[PDB]
Coordinates of C-alpha atoms and ligand atoms in Angstrom, one line a residue:
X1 CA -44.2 -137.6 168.6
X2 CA -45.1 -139.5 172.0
X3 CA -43.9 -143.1 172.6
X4 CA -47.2 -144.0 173.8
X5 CA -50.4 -143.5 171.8
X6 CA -52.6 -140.7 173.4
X7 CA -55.9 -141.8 175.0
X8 CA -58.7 -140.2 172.8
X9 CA -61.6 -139.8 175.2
X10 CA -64.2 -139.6 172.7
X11 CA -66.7 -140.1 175.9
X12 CA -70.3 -138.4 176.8
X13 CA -72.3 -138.6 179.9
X14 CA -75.7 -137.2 178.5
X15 CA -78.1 -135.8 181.9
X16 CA -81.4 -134.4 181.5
X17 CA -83.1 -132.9 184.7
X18 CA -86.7 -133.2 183.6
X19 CA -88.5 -129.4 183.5
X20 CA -85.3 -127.1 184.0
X21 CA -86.5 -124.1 182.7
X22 CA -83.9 -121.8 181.0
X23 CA -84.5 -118.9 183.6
X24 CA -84.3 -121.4 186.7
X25 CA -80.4 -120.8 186.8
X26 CA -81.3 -116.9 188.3
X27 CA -84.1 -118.2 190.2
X28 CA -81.6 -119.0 193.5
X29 CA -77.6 -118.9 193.4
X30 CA -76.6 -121.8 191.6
X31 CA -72.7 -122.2 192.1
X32 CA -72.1 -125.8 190.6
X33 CA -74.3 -124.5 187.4
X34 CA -72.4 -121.8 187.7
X35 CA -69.4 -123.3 188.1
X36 CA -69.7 -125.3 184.6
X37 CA -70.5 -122.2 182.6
X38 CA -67.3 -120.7 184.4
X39 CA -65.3 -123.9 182.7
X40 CA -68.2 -125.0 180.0
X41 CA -69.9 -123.8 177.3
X42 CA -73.4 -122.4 178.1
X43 CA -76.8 -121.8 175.7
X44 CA -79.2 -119.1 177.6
X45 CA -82.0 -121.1 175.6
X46 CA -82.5 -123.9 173.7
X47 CA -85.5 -124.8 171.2
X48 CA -87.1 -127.7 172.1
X49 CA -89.6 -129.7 169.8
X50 CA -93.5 -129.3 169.5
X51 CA -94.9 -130.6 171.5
X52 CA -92.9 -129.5 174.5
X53 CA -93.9 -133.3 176.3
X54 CA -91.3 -135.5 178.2
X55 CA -91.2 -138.4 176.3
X56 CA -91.3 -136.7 172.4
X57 CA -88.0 -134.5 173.3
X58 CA -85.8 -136.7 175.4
X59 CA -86.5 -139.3 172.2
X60 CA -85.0 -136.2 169.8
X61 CA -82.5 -135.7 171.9
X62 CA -81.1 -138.6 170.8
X63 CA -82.2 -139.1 167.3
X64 CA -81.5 -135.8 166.2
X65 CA -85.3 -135.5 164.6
X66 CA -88.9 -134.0 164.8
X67 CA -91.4 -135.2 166.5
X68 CA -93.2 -136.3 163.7
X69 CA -90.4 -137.8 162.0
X70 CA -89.1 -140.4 164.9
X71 CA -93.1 -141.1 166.0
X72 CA -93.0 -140.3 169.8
X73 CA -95.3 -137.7 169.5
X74 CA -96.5 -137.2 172.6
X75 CA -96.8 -138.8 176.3
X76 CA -100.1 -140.2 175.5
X77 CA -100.7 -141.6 171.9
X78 CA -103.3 -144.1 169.5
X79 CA -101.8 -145.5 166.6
X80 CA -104.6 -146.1 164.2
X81 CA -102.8 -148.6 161.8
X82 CA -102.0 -150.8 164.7
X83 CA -104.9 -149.7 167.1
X84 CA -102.8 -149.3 170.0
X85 CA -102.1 -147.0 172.7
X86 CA -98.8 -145.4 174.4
X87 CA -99.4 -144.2 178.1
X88 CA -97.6 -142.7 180.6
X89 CA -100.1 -143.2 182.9
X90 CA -99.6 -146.9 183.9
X91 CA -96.0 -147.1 182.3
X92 CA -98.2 -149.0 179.3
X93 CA -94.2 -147.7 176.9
X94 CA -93.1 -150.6 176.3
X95 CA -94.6 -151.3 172.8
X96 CA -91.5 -151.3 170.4
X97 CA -93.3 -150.5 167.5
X98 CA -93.7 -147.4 169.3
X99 CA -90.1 -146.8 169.4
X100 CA -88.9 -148.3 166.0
X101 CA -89.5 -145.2 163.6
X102 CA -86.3 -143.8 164.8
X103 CA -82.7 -145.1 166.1
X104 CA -81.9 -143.7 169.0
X105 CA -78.1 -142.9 169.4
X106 CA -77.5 -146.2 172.2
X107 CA -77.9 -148.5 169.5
X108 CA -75.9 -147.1 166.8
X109 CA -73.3 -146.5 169.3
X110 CA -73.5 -150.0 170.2
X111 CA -73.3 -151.2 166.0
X112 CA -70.2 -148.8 165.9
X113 CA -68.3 -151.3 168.2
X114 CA -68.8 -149.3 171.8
X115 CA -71.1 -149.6 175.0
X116 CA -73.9 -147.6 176.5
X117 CA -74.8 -147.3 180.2
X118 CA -78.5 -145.8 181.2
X119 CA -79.7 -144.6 184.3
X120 CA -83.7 -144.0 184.0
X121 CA -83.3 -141.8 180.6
X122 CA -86.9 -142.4 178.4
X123 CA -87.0 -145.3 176.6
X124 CA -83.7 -147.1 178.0
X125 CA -85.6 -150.1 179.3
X126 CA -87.3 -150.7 176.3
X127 CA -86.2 -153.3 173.5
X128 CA -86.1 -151.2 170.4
X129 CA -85.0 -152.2 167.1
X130 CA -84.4 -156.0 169.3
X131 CA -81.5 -154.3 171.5
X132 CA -81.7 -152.6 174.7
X133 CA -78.1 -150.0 176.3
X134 CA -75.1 -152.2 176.7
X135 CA -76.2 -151.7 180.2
X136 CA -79.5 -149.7 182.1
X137 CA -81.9 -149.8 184.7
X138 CA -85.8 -150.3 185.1
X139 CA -87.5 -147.4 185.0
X140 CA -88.2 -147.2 188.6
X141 CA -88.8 -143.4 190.1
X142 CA -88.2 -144.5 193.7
X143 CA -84.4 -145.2 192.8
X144 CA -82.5 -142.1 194.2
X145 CA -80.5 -139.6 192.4
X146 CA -77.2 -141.0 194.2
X147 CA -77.6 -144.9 193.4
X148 CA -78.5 -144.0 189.7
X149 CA -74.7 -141.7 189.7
X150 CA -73.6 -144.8 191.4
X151 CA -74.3 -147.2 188.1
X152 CA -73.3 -144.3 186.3
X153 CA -69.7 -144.0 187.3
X154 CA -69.5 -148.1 187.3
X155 CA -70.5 -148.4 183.9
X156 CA -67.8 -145.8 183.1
X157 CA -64.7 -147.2 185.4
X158 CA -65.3 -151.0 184.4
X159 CA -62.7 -153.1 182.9
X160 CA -64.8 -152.6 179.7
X161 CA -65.9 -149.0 179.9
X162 CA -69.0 -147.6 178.0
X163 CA -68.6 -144.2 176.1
X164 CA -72.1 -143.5 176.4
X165 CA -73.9 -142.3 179.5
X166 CA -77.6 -141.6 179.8
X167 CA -78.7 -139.5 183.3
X168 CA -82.6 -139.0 184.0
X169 CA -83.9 -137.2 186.8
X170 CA -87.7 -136.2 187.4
X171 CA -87.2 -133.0 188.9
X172 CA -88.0 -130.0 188.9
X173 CA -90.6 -131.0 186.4
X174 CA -92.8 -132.7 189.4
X175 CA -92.4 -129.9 191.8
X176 CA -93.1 -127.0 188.9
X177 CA -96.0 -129.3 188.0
X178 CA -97.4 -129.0 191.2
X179 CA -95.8 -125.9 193.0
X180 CA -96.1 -124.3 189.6
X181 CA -92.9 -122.1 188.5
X182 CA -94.1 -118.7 190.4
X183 CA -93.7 -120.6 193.6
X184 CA -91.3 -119.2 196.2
X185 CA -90.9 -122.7 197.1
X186 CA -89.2 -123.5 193.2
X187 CA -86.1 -122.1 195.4
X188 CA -85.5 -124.9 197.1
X189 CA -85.9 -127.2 194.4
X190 CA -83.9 -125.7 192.4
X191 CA -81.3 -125.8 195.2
X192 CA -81.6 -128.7 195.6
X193 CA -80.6 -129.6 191.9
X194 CA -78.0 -127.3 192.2
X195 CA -76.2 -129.7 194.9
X196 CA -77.2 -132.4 193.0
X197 CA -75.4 -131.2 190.2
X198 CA -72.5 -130.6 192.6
X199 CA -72.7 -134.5 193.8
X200 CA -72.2 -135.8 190.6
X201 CA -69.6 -133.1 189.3
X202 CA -67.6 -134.8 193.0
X203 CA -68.1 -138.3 191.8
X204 CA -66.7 -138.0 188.4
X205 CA -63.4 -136.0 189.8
X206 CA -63.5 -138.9 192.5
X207 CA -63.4 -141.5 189.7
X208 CA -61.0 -139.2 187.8
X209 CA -64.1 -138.4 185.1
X210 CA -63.7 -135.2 185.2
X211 CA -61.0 -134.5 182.9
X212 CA -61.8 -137.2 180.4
X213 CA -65.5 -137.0 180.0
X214 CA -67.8 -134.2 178.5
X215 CA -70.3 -133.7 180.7
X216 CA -73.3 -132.7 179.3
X217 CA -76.6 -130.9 181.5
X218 CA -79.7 -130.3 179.6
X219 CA -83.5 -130.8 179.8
X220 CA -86.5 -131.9 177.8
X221 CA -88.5 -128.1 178.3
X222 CA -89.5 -125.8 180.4
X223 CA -92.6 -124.8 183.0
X224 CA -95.3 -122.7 182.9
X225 CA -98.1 -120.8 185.4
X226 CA -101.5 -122.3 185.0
X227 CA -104.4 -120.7 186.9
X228 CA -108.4 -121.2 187.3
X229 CA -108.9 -118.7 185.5
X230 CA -107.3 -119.7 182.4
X231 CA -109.3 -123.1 181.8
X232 CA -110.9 -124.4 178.8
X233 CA -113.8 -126.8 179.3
X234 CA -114.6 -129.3 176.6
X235 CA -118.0 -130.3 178.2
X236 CA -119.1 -127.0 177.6
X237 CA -118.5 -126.8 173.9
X238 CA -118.8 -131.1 172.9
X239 CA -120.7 -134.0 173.7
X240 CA -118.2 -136.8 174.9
X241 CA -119.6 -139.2 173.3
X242 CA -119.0 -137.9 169.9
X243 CA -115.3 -138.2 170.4
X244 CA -112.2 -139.9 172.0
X245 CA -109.8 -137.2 174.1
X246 CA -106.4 -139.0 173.1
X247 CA -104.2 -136.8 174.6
X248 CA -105.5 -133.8 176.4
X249 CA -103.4 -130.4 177.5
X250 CA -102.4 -128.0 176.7
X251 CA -102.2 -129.7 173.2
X252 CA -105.7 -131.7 172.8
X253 CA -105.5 -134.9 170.3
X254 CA -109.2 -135.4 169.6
X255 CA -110.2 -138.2 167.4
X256 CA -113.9 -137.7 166.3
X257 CA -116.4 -140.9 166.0
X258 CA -117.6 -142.0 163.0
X259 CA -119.3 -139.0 161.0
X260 CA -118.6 -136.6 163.8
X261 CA -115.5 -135.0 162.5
X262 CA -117.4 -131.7 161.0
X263 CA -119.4 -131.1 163.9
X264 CA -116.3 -131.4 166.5
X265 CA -114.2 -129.5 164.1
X266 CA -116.9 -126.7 164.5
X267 CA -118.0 -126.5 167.7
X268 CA -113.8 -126.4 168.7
X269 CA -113.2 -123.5 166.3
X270 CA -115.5 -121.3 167.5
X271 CA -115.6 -123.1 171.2
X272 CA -112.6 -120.1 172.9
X273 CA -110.3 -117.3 172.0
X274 CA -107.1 -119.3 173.5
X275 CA -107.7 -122.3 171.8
X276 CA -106.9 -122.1 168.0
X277 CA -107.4 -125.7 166.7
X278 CA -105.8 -127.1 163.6
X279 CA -107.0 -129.9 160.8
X280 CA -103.9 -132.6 161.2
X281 CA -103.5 -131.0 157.4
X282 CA -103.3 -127.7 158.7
X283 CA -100.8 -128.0 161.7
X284 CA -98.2 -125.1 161.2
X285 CA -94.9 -126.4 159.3
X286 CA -92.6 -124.8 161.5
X287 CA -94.2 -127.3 164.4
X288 CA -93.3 -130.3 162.3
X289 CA -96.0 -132.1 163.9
X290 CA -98.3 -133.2 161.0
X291 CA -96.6 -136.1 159.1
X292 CA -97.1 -139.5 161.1
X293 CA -100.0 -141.6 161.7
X294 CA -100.1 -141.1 165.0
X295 CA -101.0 -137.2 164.7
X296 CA -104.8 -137.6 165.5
X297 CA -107.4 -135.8 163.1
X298 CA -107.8 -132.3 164.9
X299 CA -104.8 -130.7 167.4
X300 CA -106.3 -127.6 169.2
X301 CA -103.5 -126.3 171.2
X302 CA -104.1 -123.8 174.1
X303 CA -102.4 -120.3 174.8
X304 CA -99.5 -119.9 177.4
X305 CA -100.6 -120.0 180.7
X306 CA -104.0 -122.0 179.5
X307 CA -105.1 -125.3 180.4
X308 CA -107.5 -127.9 178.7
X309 CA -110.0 -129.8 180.5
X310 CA -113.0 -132.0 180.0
X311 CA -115.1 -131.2 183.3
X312 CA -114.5 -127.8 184.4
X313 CA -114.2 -129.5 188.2
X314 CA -111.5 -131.6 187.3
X315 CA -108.3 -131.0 188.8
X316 CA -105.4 -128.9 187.1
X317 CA -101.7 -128.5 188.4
X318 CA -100.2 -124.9 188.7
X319 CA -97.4 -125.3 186.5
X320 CA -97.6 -126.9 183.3
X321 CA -95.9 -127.7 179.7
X322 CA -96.7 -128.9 176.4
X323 CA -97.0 -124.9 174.6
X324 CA -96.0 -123.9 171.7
X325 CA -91.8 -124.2 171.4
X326 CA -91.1 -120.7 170.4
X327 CA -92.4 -120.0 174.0
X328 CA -89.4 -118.9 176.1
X329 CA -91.5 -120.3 179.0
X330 CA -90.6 -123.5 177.1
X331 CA -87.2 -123.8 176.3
X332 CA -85.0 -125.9 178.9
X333 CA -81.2 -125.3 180.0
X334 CA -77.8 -126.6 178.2
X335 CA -74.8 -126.9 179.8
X336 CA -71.4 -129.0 178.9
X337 CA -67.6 -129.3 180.0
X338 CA -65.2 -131.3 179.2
X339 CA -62.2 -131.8 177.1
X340 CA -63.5 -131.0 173.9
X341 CA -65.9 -127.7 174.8
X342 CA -64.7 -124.7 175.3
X343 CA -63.6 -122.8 178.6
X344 CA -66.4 -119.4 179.8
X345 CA -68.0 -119.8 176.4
X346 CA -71.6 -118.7 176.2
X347 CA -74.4 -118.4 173.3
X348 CA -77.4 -117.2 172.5
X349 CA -79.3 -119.9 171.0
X350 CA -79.3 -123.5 170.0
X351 CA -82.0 -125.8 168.4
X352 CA -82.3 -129.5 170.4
X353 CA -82.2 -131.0 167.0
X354 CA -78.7 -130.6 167.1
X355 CA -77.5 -132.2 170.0
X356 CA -77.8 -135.7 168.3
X357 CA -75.5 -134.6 165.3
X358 CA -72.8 -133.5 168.3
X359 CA -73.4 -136.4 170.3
X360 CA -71.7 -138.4 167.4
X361 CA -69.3 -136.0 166.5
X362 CA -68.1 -136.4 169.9
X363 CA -68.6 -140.1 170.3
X364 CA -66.6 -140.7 166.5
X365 CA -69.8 -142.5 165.1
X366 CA -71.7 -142.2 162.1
X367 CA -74.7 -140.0 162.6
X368 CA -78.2 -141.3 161.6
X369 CA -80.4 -139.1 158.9
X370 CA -81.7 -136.2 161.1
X371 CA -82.7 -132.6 161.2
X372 CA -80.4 -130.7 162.7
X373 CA -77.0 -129.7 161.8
X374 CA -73.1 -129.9 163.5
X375 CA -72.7 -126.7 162.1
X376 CA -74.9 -124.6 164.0
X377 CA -73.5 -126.1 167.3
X378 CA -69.5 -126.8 166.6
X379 CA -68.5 -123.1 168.0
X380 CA -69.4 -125.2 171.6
X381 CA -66.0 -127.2 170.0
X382 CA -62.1 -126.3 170.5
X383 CA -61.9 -127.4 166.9
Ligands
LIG1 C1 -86.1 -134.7 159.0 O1 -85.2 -135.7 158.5 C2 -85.8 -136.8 157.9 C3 -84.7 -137.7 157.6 O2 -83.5 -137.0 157.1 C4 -86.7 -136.4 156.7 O3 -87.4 -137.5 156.3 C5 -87.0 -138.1 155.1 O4 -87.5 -137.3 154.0 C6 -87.1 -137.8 152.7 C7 -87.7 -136.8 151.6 O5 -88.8 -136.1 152.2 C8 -87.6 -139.2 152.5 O6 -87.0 -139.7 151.3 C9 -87.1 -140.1 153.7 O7 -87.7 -141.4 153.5 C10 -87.6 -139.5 155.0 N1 -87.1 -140.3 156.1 C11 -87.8 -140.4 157.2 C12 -87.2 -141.3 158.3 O8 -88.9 -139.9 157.3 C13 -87.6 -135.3 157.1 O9 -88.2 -134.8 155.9 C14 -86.9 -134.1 157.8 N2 -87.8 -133.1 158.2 C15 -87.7 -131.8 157.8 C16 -88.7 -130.9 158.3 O10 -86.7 -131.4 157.1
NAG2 C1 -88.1 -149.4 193.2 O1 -86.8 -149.8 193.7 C2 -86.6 -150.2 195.0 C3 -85.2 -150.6 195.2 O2 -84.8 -151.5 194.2 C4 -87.6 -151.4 195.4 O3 -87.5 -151.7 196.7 C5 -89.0 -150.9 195.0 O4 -89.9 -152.0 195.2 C6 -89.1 -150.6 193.5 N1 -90.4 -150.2 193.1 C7 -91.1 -150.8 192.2 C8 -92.5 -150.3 191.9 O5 -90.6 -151.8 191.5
NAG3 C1 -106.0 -115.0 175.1 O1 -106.9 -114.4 174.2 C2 -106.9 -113.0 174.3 C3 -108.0 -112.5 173.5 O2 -109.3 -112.6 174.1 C4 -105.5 -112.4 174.0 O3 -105.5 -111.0 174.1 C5 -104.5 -113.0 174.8 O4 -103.2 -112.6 174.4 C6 -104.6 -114.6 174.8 N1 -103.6 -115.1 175.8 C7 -102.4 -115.4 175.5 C8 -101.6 -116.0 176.6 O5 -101.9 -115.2 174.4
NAG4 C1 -82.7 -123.3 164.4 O1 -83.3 -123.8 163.2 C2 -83.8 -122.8 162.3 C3 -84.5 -123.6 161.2 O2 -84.4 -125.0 161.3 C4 -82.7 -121.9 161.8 O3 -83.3 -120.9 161.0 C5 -82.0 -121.3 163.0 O4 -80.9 -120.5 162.6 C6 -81.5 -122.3 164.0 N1 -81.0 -121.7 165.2 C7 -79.8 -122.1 165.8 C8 -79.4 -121.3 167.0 O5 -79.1 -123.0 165.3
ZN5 ZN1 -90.3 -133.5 180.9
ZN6 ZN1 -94.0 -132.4 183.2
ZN7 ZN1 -96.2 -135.3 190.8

């Protein structure tokens, strides 16, 4: 019996660092992630989605579903019911019908009656669904690490507080891109998210965060090491002009001109050894990357370690992502403490479809229709 009513802190602060491989924690020393697992719970590898893109796993992160199932299948996209494109490229994202096959966790937090701050996290400055977060920034990579904390720990001290926090970061998925993860030179970039880690964990215990909020570090995939000699040239097995290159590599999205479907499908078969290519029919189930409109007619997905390109000149960064998710070169980091995880806990495994289910559990709000489960994930819970 207490005379006051005790404060539930049903309260999240979601951060993604975009590329952290699971291995990068044993790369250099890494005392703040080290820190966390010493007070957190900590997963020595999580399975991401196929495919292993940016955009399609931060976006089942929070809707708790398959690629196919919440429609951002990958970076670069063409919708053929609408005949439109997504692109990364020239930030061309902002399409909401893009968006709208899934309900990302922001807005049903926001129908349960709470608020959502976003700092940079995918899709956060789009209007989806006719809503935006209660409160978020414009995707603008220049913004530093510190000034995006900074709107972070506003959002959460205000006189109305949010429950909700979204944290984006770009690296070390721009540095493994172009250092690739082999690099000596990862070190320091890994470093460097190590004390970037350890600036925000000093923020929140200066707001007097630290205690209330469950802090949660995790990533979208992994890296891994490209090389020149592991490329795959379309030019030399396909006339360009009997197709469209929709998305490109590792995972190619090739939509075939008119009648030209049965002689791309077999010159791409029979084209190279590392490249096995799929009928959208025949994509492998456990991918669950088939069933959406937006899956173009033939996916021919490279080997670890092997790169797709049109013009066997073209240019090719050293590290790379996109590979089949069972790959362990694929699978990103997860870390969380706060009040409701566990103290020096650690497991095995955990599959990024379940996040979403927690996220709610945590947050006390009703979880949308997904495809992961609570269950697999609630011995991260002290209840
Ligand atoms: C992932 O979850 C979604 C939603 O729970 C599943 O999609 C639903 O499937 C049922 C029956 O197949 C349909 O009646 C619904 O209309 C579907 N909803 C949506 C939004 O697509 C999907 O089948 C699940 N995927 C897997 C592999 O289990
Ligand atoms: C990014 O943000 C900074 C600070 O707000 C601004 O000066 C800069 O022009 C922005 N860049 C773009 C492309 O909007
Ligand atoms: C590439 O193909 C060869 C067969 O020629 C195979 O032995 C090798 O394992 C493949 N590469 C990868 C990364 O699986
Ligand atoms: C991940 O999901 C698969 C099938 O969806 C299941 O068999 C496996 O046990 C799950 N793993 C974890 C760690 O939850
Ligand atoms: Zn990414
Ligand atoms: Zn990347
Ligand atoms: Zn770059």
């Amino acid at each position: 019996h207490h005379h006051h009513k005790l404060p539930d802190q049903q309260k999240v602060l979601l951060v993604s660092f975009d590329g952290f491989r699971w291995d990068y924690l044993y790369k250099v020393p890494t005392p703040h992630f080290h820190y966390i697992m010493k007070y957190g719970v900590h997963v020595k590898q999580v399975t991401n989605v196929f495919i292993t893109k940016t955009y399609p796993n931060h976006y089942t992160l929070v809707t708790g579903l398959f690629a196919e199932n919440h429609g951002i299948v990958a970076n670069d996209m063409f919708d053929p019911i609408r005949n439109k494109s997504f692109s990364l490229d020239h930030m061309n994202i902002y399409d909401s019908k893009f968006w709208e096959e899934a309900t990302p966790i922001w807005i049903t937090n926001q129908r349960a009656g709470h608020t959502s701050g976003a700092a940079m996290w995918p899709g956060t400055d789009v209007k989806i669904h006719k809503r935006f977060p209660t409160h978020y920034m414009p995707y603008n990579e220049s913004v530093s690490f510190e000034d995006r904390v900074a709107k972070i720990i506003e959002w959460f001290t205000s006189k109305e507080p949010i429950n909700l926090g979204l944290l984006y970061w770009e690296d070390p998925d721009d540095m493994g891109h172009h250092l690739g993860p082999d690099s000596p030179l990862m070190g320091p970039v890994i470093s460097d998210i190590d004390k970037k880690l350890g600036y925000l964990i000093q923020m929140l215990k200066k707001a007097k965060l630290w205690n209330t909020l469950n802090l949660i570090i995790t990533s979208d995939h992994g890296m891994t090491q490209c090389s020149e000699e592991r490329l795959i040239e379309l030019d030399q097995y396909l006339d360009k002009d009997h197709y469209t290159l929709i998305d490109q590599s590792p995972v190619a999205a090739i939509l075939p001109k008119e009648g030209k479907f049965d002689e791309v499908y077999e010159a791409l078969t029979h084209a190279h050894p590392n490249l096995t290519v799929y009928k959208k029919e025949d994509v492998p189930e456990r991918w669950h990357y088939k069933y959406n409109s937006r899956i173009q007619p033939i996916i021919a997905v490279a080997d670890e370690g092997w790169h797709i390109l049109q013009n066997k000149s073209d240019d090719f960064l050293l590290g790379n992502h996109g590979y089949d998710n069972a790959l362990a070169d694929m699978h990103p980091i997860f870390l969380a403490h706060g009040p409701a995880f566990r103290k020096n806990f650690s497991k095995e495994a955990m599959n990024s479809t379940d996040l979403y289910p927690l996220l709610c559990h945590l947050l006390n709000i009703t979880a949308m229709p997904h495809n992961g489960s609570f269950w697999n994930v609630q011995d991260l819970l002290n209840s």
